[PDB]
Design a protein around this nucleic acid. Structure first.
Ligand SMILES: Cc1cc2c(cc1C)N(C[C@H](O)[C@H](O)[C@H](O)COP(=O)(O)OP(=O)(O)OC[C@H]1O[C@@H](n3cnc4c(N)ncnc43)[C@H](O)[C@@H]1O)c1[nH]c(=O)[nH]c(=O)c1N2
Length: 458
DNA sequence: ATCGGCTTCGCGCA
DNA sequence: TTGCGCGAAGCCGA
């Protein structure tokens, strides 16, 4: 019943007579998960129960309370949802390449399954796991509508090369999800969420008046809330998306990106629901292009350039152009600290930084601006990269994500873009100006909203 | 082929 | 505001 182009064999072996174990990692939800649906099947095709394992890692120390609380409040709800269908969830603390490896032994796992990520480190882990299990090891793309290694086989130069590949594959791969069959047969998150927050408090972004910057109430975490954010977008916001998606003063975005990043909702379900929805076709076309083409070319990009977060993976015309302007006199140079605390000369730029700092989700359009100004106002393209990756990943609820590196790459280095008119400092890299912003939206509204923060933020 | 078209440009202009 | 034509620009893919 499940399309088998979704499964890839990591380590062929003989099946053990124990349970099927889903090493969960990317797709932290219970519904609409091909990898957990696939685990139920081969557990049922062998009469063993299915179980799920998650592994907390030391990565959360590289970002903030905001995301750790987002993720873990998701797991507390997941965990209950899984128990309801009799599927135990066990949570591990440490390096997967050792902990998953042990778990597979201590539990006599018959077969191992994991969801798919393109980030370098998940493959580092897969290979320590492969190297230490005797059972078989299976990988299922639960994140993409069309499995990343099937849509294309090379790096897609631009979205217009990639778009027909994927759409010709859609009619075979866009299906409804079966329901999750309950089966028949470590630590507690409570303490895990407390130790982490006690460890992350020293970094928690505060204002001069001691209070935190972050506003936790713009995005309730979990599978439930995410489903409600999709249903709402589809009824109130999808008709307006094409027209109003570049207005930072509206709130016409879907606001799914923090759910999708953590897999708290399946992008395949959004597609299904949008397709079936009767709205302005131009909005459905413009929205599907984001959640389909751009989301998955971002996976295609990471999976095929391991240097995804470095200057080297820029296309050639862009490396040479930026090189030629390495010795240009930047108008302004800021340090990482100065960007962070919104101390530029450009009250629009600082505004988008206040929106990132306090909410954890910067508007789609401003994110572009945000990034191209860092290039202009740093001493080199490598610092621009570094500052951009650092701030994005540390402050976006949807950061540490393929969409993130591929998005910066587009802004700073023209991955998936094209060559525009040569400029000093920024080369042939597409330019964006404050007056360019002015004909698109009421700049001073934006500026006005977050003006009150910068005075207070230290 | 080899020429047309390319996410989300800026800017004059009506 | 908002829609259009133009400008500078490298490259894939039918
Ligand atoms: C400098 C910079 C940095 C980043 C990003 C872009 C830029 C220019 N992006 C991509 C994009 O800015 C971001 O995904 C949206 O703001 C997500 O918000 P909504 O769900 O509200 O988008 P919206 O409703 O407009 O679109 C819905 C979905 O489309 C996808 N999408 C939209 N724009 C995209 C883009 N340009 N590239 C890839 N996928 C895109 C996302 O999956 C998003 O969930 C990204 N994305 C992300 O999830 N995490 C990140 O940390 C970053 N980092």
């Amino acid at each position: 019943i499940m399309n088998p182009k979704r499964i890839r064999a990591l380590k062929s072996g003989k099946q053990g007579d124990g349970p099927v174990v889903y090493w969960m990692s990317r797709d932290q939800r219970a519904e609409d998960n091909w990898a957990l649906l696939f685990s139920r099947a081969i557990a049922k095709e062998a009469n063993v129960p299915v179980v799920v394992v998650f592994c907390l890692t030391d990565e959360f120390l590289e970002a903030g309370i905001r995301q750790y609380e987002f993720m873990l409040k998701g797991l507390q709800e997941l965990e209950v949802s899984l128990s309801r269908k009799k599927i135990p969830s066990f949570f591990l603390r440490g390096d997967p390449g050792e902990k998953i490896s042990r778990f597979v032994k201590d539990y006599n796992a018959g077969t191992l399954v994991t969801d798919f990520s393109p980030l370098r480190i998940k493959n580092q882990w897969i290979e320590k796991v492969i190297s230490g299990i005797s059972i078989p090891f299976f990988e299922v793309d639960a994140h993409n509508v069309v499995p990343c290694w099937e849509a294309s086989q090379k790096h897609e130069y631009a979205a217009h090369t990639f778009r027909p590949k994927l759409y010709a594959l859609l009619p075979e791969f866009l299906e409804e999800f079966p329901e999750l069959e309950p089966n028949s047969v470590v630590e507690t998150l409570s303490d895990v969420l407390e130790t982490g927050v006690k460890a992350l408090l020293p970094e928690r972004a505060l204002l001069k008046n001691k209070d935190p910057l972050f506003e936790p109430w713009h995005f309730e975490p979990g599978e439930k809330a995410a489903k409600k954010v999709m249903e709402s977008f589809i009824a109130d916001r999808l008709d307006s998306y094409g027209a109003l998606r570049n207005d930072p003063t509206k709130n016409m975005l879907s606001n799914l990106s923090p759910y999708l990043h953590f897999g708290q909702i399946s992008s395949q379900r959004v597609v299904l629901e949008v397709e079936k929805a009767e709205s302005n076709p131009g909005s459905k076309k413009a929205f599907l292009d984001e959640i389909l083409i751009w989301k998955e070319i971002s996976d295609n990009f990471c999976y095929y350039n391991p240097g995804y977060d470095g200057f080297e993976s820029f296309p050639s015309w862009a490396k040479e152009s930026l090189n030629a302007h390495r010795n240009d006199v930047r108008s302004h140079i800021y340090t990482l600290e100065e960007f962070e605390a919104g101390k530029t000369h450009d009250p629009l730029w600082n505004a988008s930084q206040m929106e990132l700092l306090s909410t954890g989700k910067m508007h789609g359009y401003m994110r572009m601006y945000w990034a191209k100004k860092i290039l202009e106002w740093s001493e080199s393209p490598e610092k621009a990269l570094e500052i951009a990756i650092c701030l994005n990943d540390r402050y976006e609820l949807d950061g540490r994500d393929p969409n993130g590196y591929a998005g910066i790459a587009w802004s700073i280095g023209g991955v998936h873009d094209r060559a525009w008119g040569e400029r000093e400092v920024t080369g042939k890299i597409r330019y964006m100006s404050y007056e360019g912003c002015k004909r698109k939206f009421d700049v001073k509204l934006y500026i006005e909203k977050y003006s009150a923060l910068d005075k207070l933020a230290a």
